[PDB]
Design a protein around this nucleic acid. Structure first.
Lengths: 40, 225, 257, 84, 213
DNA sequence: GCGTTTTAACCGCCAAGG
DNA sequence: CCTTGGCGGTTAAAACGC
């Protein structure tokens, strides 16, 4: 059970990191879409 | 084309310009005359056979070490720290099986030339120490585990405390360590070979010495060979 | 696809190079001044049914047997000709139910020009398949794969072996395991997959040559040889043009050749 | 500068077969040229045999200098190299 | 029909480019990595199904791990070119776009071929780096081949540690060409070292090093 | 004299033969 | 393998419309 708890903690940490990186990524996606619209 | 290539004192294989051809001769640093066809025992067989051969359970009585082969069979069942050690050994064995079966030898071939013949060493020990008879061994499980674990760290191909040197040294003996751990498992030692203590230290010392003797000698003109 | 013969045959047909010359049985040139009719009575029915520029008629008869064998369509051949020649040639093709599969063409002193165009047509009209792959064979391979119980059991699978090499194009064909396509010409392997793949392929070829007659040579020797041949980033041939083009001493180099 | 300190010597601690052969040859030649012998000779007369007897007892007064590819070297005494 | 196969090949090239950008250290969202073919047709293909290469251009920034390990990793701009043949004008305007938006690295994927004049102005785009790939050779990801081991670019500190450990000079390492397909996949610049961990039948695992040219 | 275009010398790339 | 001659081509510049 101790091992399972540690595994769950690490999984939650990884999930938080992925969420933060996705939040950062969406800004770049928006900028790219705006610039591609500008080129058109 | 290959005349000016020679094994140097740091293990690398270089030409006359000093350019590196290989970072370790033969990728293991061994001599061509000091290898023999051996079978790695963790590769073949079904999962059930592997589990039956290598797993040791100290909680279930009928899935434990037989009591007639060990003197201390009374105070073994129910121990949890020794079970932790056995579980670590079995996890190492499973990792070795996965590494050999999924990366190195995908087609499952298990007969490969490797240094120091282990079968010959074991039967020499059995003949030397008269390991016949139904006598019970006095070799405790922690001694087996720690002895094999320490042996797998004294197979020096490269000397030095550098971190990159340590990584190369660990890489150079992966297959051989897999072989050694496949042969010198706890269940196999206690049941199949029935070694006692003195035979066990003799086997460990002999393995280490023969491995040291099987390395390549600096100054080999391996290109011409 | 590996375990199904029908899909494997489909892939084999899709890969093999096939040109118009492969299926063409004979070619002919006729004089016919009426674009809306013809002089030949045999082809008169088909052309009149179709109808319901230069007078020089260029026709050619396709072998029905091989045309069927290559699984081709007269419409496909006509479309290929139209694509390669745009609208410079008016093309009519007989139906599949005709006694002889024929296709007619017309240009929209030209006899020599027509002959040259016919030669070009027989030359470089590509119907389908990867260029450079002359022949393809179906081969059964025995592979040992762990079972659901961990036991190793033999297994038979279908694979293709070709004549001629085009690694980059064949690797891109859908239905092909692009992560395992292999070639016996390591120059192309170097041009496609890099230098480490070239090292592995070179070792495999050398071992194949040595071990054919049952002989055995230790691994480290061939490893040293193929590490020498590929240590400069490119294939260094074992000749004077490979060895003598190094930075080694002049006295050492002059002793060879 | 080029010499490597005794504490940081990283070459093998064993006498390679080439080093053994060269050491035996040099010692045999020196004995044949009336060099002092550092071991007691029972009844031996062959210089090579005397050299082998000296080597077995770690009494050869020679030093091996192992040249690394970059030009640096390690000095090992024949009395501290392990011989099989 | 042929439109379907063209779209499929374009989708495969897009997936390969995204994988390459991920390998070089930049961050690509997991949802974008698994962006399937039907979604690609929905987003790119028009009413007649024709694709626009201009809608596939994207941007990426290095992950914190890659940024920490490699301090020279900037922003990456990947653009597909509509023109089947690229000339001096198109390369010049791409260079202008890179310079005005101060991108560290720009990848320019063309369709058929690139004129030599356009090749001439690639080295003069400093300090930004412009790398060009053809569409045909990106359909298959070569680094997923069986024969191709894993190449990892070494940082400057690791390269220094390597040269000190072996007491080497840069000319004494095994070499890898700059036009080598894996070298172009990793965007190797002259003087950089890749570590290759390789299967070995004598020791299991063997790590080799090569230096670019 | 601004927007545009043609031939032009010029340029490099490539195939063939010694 | 190398030189050789030639091929092709793009891009530029002189010239045009207008």
């Amino acid at each position: 059970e101790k091992r399972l708890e540690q595994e769950q903690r690490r999984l939650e940490e990884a999930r938080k990191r992925q969420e933060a990186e996705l939040i950062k990524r969406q800004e770049l996606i928006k900028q790219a879409e705006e610039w591609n619209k500008m080129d058109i | 084309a290959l005349e000016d290539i020679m094994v140097h004192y740091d293990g690398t294989t270089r030409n006359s310009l000093g350019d590196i051809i290989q970072f370790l001769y033969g990728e293991d640093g061994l001599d061509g005359t000091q290898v023999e066809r051996q079978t790695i025992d963790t590769i073949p067989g079904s999962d059930k056979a592997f589990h039956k051969r290598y797993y040791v359970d100290l909680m279930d009585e009928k899935n434990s070490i037989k009591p007639d082969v060990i003197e201390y069979a009374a105070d073994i069942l129910g121990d949890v720290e020794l079970q932790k050690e056995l579980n670590s050994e079995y996890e190492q064995l499973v990792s070795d099986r996965k590494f050999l079966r999924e990366i190195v030898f995908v087609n499952g071939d298990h007969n490969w030339p490797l240094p120091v013949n282990l079968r010959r060493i074991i039967q020499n020990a059995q003949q030397i120490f008269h390991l016949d008879r139904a006598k019970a061994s006095d070799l405790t499980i922690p001694e087996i585990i720690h002895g094999v674990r320490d042996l797998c760290k004294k197979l020096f191909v490269l000397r030095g405390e550098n971190e990159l040197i340590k990584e190369a040294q660990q890489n150079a003996t992966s297959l051989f360590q897999c072989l050694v751990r496949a042969r010198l498992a706890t269940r196999r030692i206690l049941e199949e070979f029935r070694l006692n203590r003195d035979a066990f230290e003799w086997v460990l010392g002999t393995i280490e010495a023969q491995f040291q003797r099987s390395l390549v000698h600096p100054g080999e003109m391996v290109g011409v060979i | 696809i590996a375990l199904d013969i029908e899909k494997a045959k489909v892939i084999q047909s899709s890969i093999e190079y096939t040109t118009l010359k492969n299926v063409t049985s004979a070619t002919e040139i006729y004089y016919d001044p009426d674009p809306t009719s013809t002089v030949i009575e045999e082809d008169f029915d088909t052309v009149e049914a179709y109808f319901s520029q230069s007078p020089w008629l260029l026709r050619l008869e396709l072998d029905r047997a091989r045309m069927l064998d290559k699984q081709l369509t007269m419409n496909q051949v006509a479309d290929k000709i139209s694509e390669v020649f745009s609208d410079d040639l008016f093309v009519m093709w007989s139906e599949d139910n005709a006694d002889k599969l024929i296709i007619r063409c017309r240009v929209i002193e030209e006899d020599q020009m027509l002959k040259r165009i016919e030669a070009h047509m027989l030359d470089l009209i590509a119907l389908r398949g990867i260029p450079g792959i002359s022949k393809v064979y179906m081969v059964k391979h025995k592979v040992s794969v762990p079972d659901e119980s961990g036991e190793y059991k033999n297994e038979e699978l279908w694979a293709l072996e070709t004549d001629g090499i085009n690694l980059a194009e064949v690797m891109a064909v859908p239905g092909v395991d692009s992560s395992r396509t292999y070639s016996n010409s390591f120059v192309e392997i170097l041009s496609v997959l890099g230098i480490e793949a070239t090292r592995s392929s070179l070792y495999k070829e050398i071992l194949n040559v040595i071990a054919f007659d049952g002989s055995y040579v230790n691994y480290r020797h061939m490893a040293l040889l193929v590490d020498v041949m590929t240590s400069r980033g490119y294939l260094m041939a074992i000749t004077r043009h490979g060895i003598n083009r190094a930075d080694t001493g002049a006295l050492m180099r002059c002793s060879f050749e | 500068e080029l010499a490597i300190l005794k504490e940081e010597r990283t070459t093998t601690p064993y006498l390679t077969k080439y080093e053994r052969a060269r050491i035996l040859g040099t010692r045999a030649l020196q004995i044949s040229m009336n060099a002092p012998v550092l071991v007691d000779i029972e009844g031996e007369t062959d210089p090579l045999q005397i050299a082998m007897k000296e080597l077995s007892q770690r009494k050869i007064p020679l030093v091996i200098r192992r040249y690394l590819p970059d030009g640096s070297y390690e000095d090992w005494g024949c009395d501290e190299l392990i011989v099989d | 029909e042929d439109n379907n196969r063209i779209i499929s090949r374009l989708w495969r090239s897009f997936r390969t480019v995204k994988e390459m950008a991920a390998d070089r250290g930049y961050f690509i969202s997991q949802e974008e990595m698994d962006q399937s073919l039907e979604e690609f047709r929905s987003k790119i293909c028009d009413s007649m199904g024709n694709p626009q290469r201009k809608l596939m251009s994207f941007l990426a920034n290095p992950t914190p791990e890659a940024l920490e390990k490699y301090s020279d990793l900037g922003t990456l701009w990947v653009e597909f070119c509509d023109e089947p043949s690229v000339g001096i004008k198109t390369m010049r305007n791409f260079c202008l776009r890179i310079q005005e938006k101060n991108f560290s690295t720009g990848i320019f994927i063309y369709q058929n071929n690139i004129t030599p004049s356009a090749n001439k102005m690639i080295p003069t785009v400093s300090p930004a780096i412009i790398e060009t790939f053809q569409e045909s050779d990106l359909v298959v990801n070569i680094t997923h081949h069986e024969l191709v081991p894993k190449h990892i670019r070494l940082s400057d500190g690791e390269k220094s540690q390597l040269l000190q450990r072996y007491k080497l000079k840069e000319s004494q390492l095994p070499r890898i060409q700059r036009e080598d397909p894996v070298a172009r996949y990793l965007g190797l610049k002259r003087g950089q070292v890749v570590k290759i961990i390789r299967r070995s039948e004598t020791s299991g695992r063997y790590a080799s090093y090569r230096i670019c040219l």
